[PDB]
Amino acid sequence: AGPQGGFGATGGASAGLISRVANALANTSTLRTVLRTGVSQQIASSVVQRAAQSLASTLGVDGNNLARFAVQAVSRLPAGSDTSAYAQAFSSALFNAGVLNASNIDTLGSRVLSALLNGVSSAAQGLGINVDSGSVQSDISSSSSFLSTSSSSASYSQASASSTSGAGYTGPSGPSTGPSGYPGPLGGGAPFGQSGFGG
């Protein structure tokens, strides 16, 4: 991880909203421990700019340094800091689904992270970064499928919520709530800072 000329694209204010953002309804490994799809170059800095050949294009990204070199570079990185220290927790703010707090990016995102979110606007926020099917796809596909609403009870889609035991709040806004299905997924499991909510 190397800050471009001292840029240091990272936001501490967004660290409050991250877990509550759309990734909460995803519950996928992308925020849990496995690197997010289209991970930010802030953590890599080696060759993986966007992973996807579009912005990653720099050393001839098309198969060769896509499946090899890239994954190996990030995979050779010291994991002593744990995966959570990487672009794991900030996955929501770095991926930018748009169903998050818009004032976050308007106020601190574009100012503090500056260059990062500018490039992410065209990348993840723009078209949606997709990484090679080697590792990332294998993980996310097998993860997102079961972990869709596997926060506590996937069978009941936690629509009933664990408020019965007086949970109050567990993580994202409150207890095990916010169903990935049913009309109005915003029922209970909705962030206090959410813009573009709805379908």
Tab-separated table of C-alpha atoms in Angstrom:
chain	number	residue	atom	x	y	z
A	1	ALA	CA	0.000	0.000	0.000
A	2	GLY	CA	1.528	3.265	-1.129
A	3	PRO	CA	-0.055	6.756	-1.094
A	4	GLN	CA	0.323	8.400	-4.518
A	5	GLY	CA	2.550	11.390	-3.825
A	6	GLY	CA	1.195	11.470	-0.299
A	7	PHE	CA	-2.452	11.459	-1.447
A	8	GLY	CA	-3.527	8.735	0.977
A	9	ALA	CA	-7.005	7.964	-0.234
A	10	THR	CA	-8.912	6.797	2.819
A	11	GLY	CA	-11.819	8.192	4.852
A	12	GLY	CA	-12.421	7.756	8.563
A	13	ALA	CA	-15.843	9.421	8.533
A	14	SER	CA	-17.143	6.845	6.103
A	15	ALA	CA	-15.998	4.149	8.574
A	16	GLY	CA	-19.201	4.772	10.465
A	17	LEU	CA	-21.551	4.272	7.533
A	18	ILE	CA	-19.568	1.456	5.768
A	19	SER	CA	-21.212	-1.505	7.503
A	20	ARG	CA	-24.638	0.034	7.044
A	21	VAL	CA	-24.219	0.717	3.314
A	22	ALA	CA	-25.724	-1.653	0.632
A	23	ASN	CA	-22.928	-4.159	1.485
A	24	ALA	CA	-24.940	-4.895	4.647
A	25	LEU	CA	-27.634	-6.416	2.440
A	26	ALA	CA	-24.962	-8.214	0.456
A	27	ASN	CA	-23.328	-9.838	3.533
A	28	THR	CA	-20.826	-11.273	1.039
A	29	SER	CA	-17.157	-12.020	1.812
A	30	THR	CA	-16.347	-8.717	-0.013
A	31	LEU	CA	-16.678	-6.889	3.317
A	32	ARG	CA	-16.135	-9.865	5.609
A	33	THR	CA	-12.537	-10.885	4.734
A	34	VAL	CA	-12.109	-11.487	0.991
A	35	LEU	CA	-10.888	-8.486	-1.001
A	36	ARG	CA	-13.705	-6.514	-2.565
A	37	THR	CA	-14.388	-6.822	-6.262
A	38	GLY	CA	-12.263	-4.221	-7.957
A	39	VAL	CA	-10.233	-3.454	-4.857
A	40	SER	CA	-8.693	0.009	-4.633
A	41	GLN	CA	-5.071	0.460	-5.724
A	42	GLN	CA	-4.462	2.167	-2.388
A	43	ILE	CA	-3.906	-1.262	-0.835
A	44	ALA	CA	-2.145	-2.849	-3.828
A	45	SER	CA	-0.197	-0.020	-5.533
A	46	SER	CA	1.849	-2.637	-7.384
A	47	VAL	CA	0.112	-3.267	-10.709
A	48	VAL	CA	-3.534	-3.652	-9.762
A	49	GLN	CA	-4.985	-0.207	-10.437
A	50	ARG	CA	-8.578	-1.350	-10.955
A	51	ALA	CA	-7.911	-5.068	-11.666
A	52	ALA	CA	-10.290	-4.656	-14.602
A	53	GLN	CA	-8.269	-4.033	-17.790
A	54	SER	CA	-9.985	-0.647	-18.351
A	55	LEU	CA	-8.203	1.436	-15.677
A	56	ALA	CA	-5.766	-1.372	-14.797
A	57	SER	CA	-4.268	-1.075	-18.266
A	58	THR	CA	-0.646	-0.218	-17.553
A	59	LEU	CA	1.611	-3.258	-18.140
A	60	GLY	CA	-0.518	-5.028	-20.707
A	61	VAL	CA	-3.555	-6.215	-18.771
A	62	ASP	CA	-5.335	-8.931	-20.710
A	63	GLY	CA	-5.137	-12.440	-19.358
A	64	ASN	CA	-1.421	-12.772	-18.566
A	65	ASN	CA	-0.822	-10.212	-15.828
A	66	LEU	CA	-4.495	-10.463	-15.059
A	67	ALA	CA	-4.555	-14.054	-13.803
A	68	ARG	CA	-0.874	-14.001	-12.956
A	69	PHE	CA	1.293	-11.208	-11.534
A	70	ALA	CA	-1.748	-9.175	-10.333
A	71	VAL	CA	-3.247	-11.758	-7.973
A	72	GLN	CA	0.180	-12.912	-6.966
A	73	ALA	CA	1.301	-9.355	-6.192
A	74	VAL	CA	-1.653	-8.655	-3.898
A	75	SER	CA	-1.444	-12.201	-2.620
A	76	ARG	CA	2.284	-11.754	-1.803
A	77	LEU	CA	1.427	-8.719	0.294
A	78	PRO	CA	1.920	-9.213	4.041
A	79	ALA	CA	-1.319	-10.314	5.644
A	80	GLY	CA	0.015	-9.770	9.107
A	81	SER	CA	-2.105	-6.647	9.307
A	82	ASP	CA	-5.129	-8.915	8.635
A	83	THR	CA	-7.537	-8.626	5.727
A	84	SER	CA	-9.707	-6.175	7.658
A	85	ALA	CA	-6.864	-3.622	7.604
A	86	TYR	CA	-7.024	-3.685	3.814
A	87	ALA	CA	-9.852	-2.296	1.636
A	88	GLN	CA	-12.161	-4.667	3.474
A	89	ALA	CA	-13.981	-2.476	5.981
A	90	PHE	CA	-14.051	0.479	3.599
A	91	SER	CA	-15.445	-1.859	0.921
A	92	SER	CA	-18.764	-0.008	0.897
A	93	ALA	CA	-17.206	3.428	0.393
A	94	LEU	CA	-14.633	2.181	-2.075
A	95	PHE	CA	-17.142	0.195	-4.123
A	96	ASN	CA	-19.838	2.929	-3.968
A	97	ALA	CA	-23.125	1.245	-4.832
A	98	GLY	CA	-24.923	4.588	-4.827
A	99	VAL	CA	-27.421	3.418	-2.224
A	100	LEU	CA	-25.296	5.068	0.438
A	101	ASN	CA	-24.963	8.484	2.018
A	102	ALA	CA	-24.392	10.809	-0.946
A	103	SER	CA	-23.252	13.672	1.267
A	104	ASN	CA	-20.407	11.438	2.380
A	105	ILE	CA	-18.792	11.490	-1.048
A	106	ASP	CA	-19.846	15.084	-1.683
A	107	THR	CA	-18.307	16.280	1.568
A	108	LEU	CA	-15.397	14.061	2.582
A	109	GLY	CA	-15.117	11.436	-0.128
A	110	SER	CA	-14.022	13.673	-2.975
A	111	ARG	CA	-11.960	15.850	-0.605
A	112	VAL	CA	-10.143	13.351	1.602
A	113	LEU	CA	-9.861	10.422	-0.805
A	114	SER	CA	-9.776	12.865	-3.717
A	115	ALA	CA	-8.138	10.998	-6.642
A	116	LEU	CA	-9.425	7.598	-5.547
A	117	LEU	CA	-13.141	8.284	-5.652
A	118	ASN	CA	-12.674	10.287	-8.847
A	119	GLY	CA	-11.325	7.163	-10.501
A	120	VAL	CA	-13.883	4.987	-8.744
A	121	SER	CA	-16.702	7.185	-10.109
A	122	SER	CA	-15.954	5.886	-13.585
A	123	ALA	CA	-14.931	2.446	-12.313
A	124	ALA	CA	-17.103	0.784	-9.639
A	125	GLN	CA	-19.649	3.537	-9.463
A	126	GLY	CA	-19.551	3.942	-13.219
A	127	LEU	CA	-19.767	0.508	-14.798
A	128	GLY	CA	-18.993	-1.839	-11.950
A	129	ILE	CA	-15.545	-3.359	-11.673
A	130	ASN	CA	-15.322	-7.062	-12.420
A	131	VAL	CA	-12.191	-9.026	-11.581
A	132	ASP	CA	-10.822	-12.240	-13.159
A	133	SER	CA	-12.622	-15.514	-12.502
A	134	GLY	CA	-9.503	-17.028	-10.931
A	135	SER	CA	-9.904	-16.108	-7.274
A	136	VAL	CA	-12.289	-13.135	-6.860
A	137	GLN	CA	-15.173	-14.497	-8.948
A	138	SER	CA	-14.843	-17.939	-7.350
A	139	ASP	CA	-15.162	-16.415	-3.885
A	140	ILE	CA	-17.892	-13.858	-4.521
A	141	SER	CA	-20.049	-16.293	-6.512
A	142	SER	CA	-19.898	-18.972	-3.803
A	143	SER	CA	-20.202	-16.340	-1.098
A	144	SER	CA	-22.963	-13.972	-2.231
A	145	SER	CA	-25.246	-16.901	-3.084
A	146	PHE	CA	-25.485	-18.318	0.448
A	147	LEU	CA	-24.539	-15.165	2.305
A	148	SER	CA	-27.327	-13.184	0.602
A	149	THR	CA	-29.111	-12.876	3.918
A	150	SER	CA	-27.023	-15.261	5.997
A	151	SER	CA	-26.349	-12.561	8.602
A	152	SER	CA	-28.211	-14.714	11.110
A	153	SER	CA	-31.154	-16.472	9.507
A	154	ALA	CA	-31.129	-16.829	5.718
A	155	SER	CA	-34.057	-19.267	5.708
A	156	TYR	CA	-36.325	-16.622	7.241
A	157	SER	CA	-34.352	-13.869	5.488
A	158	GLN	CA	-34.198	-12.210	8.977
A	159	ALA	CA	-37.433	-10.454	8.045
A	160	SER	CA	-38.778	-11.410	11.442
A	161	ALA	CA	-35.719	-9.697	13.003
A	162	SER	CA	-33.991	-10.659	16.253
A	163	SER	CA	-35.665	-7.807	18.107
A	164	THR	CA	-37.621	-10.444	20.043
A	165	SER	CA	-34.621	-10.948	22.345
A	166	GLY	CA	-34.249	-7.203	22.797
A	167	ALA	CA	-31.192	-6.923	20.593
A	168	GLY	CA	-31.627	-3.179	20.121
A	169	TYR	CA	-28.816	-2.955	17.625
A	170	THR	CA	-26.432	-5.575	16.375
A	171	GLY	CA	-24.444	-3.870	13.643
A	172	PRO	CA	-25.989	-2.326	10.515
A	173	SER	CA	-28.448	0.162	12.069
A	174	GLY	CA	-29.929	-2.472	14.342
A	175	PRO	CA	-30.378	-6.225	14.954
A	176	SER	CA	-30.551	-9.011	12.416
A	177	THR	CA	-32.842	-7.263	10.005
A	178	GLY	CA	-32.882	-5.810	6.504
A	179	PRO	CA	-34.063	-8.602	4.183
A	180	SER	CA	-32.407	-8.955	0.785
A	181	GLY	CA	-35.837	-9.930	-0.490
A	182	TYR	CA	-39.503	-8.954	0.001
A	183	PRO	CA	-41.061	-5.595	-0.943
A	184	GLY	CA	-39.316	-2.843	0.951
A	185	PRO	CA	-35.886	-4.286	2.011
A	186	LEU	CA	-35.482	-1.018	3.922
A	187	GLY	CA	-37.745	-2.449	6.596
A	188	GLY	CA	-35.684	-2.214	9.745
A	189	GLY	CA	-32.343	-2.772	8.076
A	190	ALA	CA	-31.921	0.684	6.661
A	191	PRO	CA	-28.928	3.021	7.317
A	192	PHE	CA	-29.406	6.368	9.047
A	193	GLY	CA	-27.491	7.847	6.160
A	194	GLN	CA	-28.934	6.465	2.970
A	195	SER	CA	-29.598	8.159	-0.335
A	196	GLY	CA	-30.948	6.628	-3.524
A	197	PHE	CA	-32.857	4.084	-1.483
A	198	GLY	CA	-35.623	2.179	-3.187
A	199	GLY	CA	-36.214	0.134	-6.275
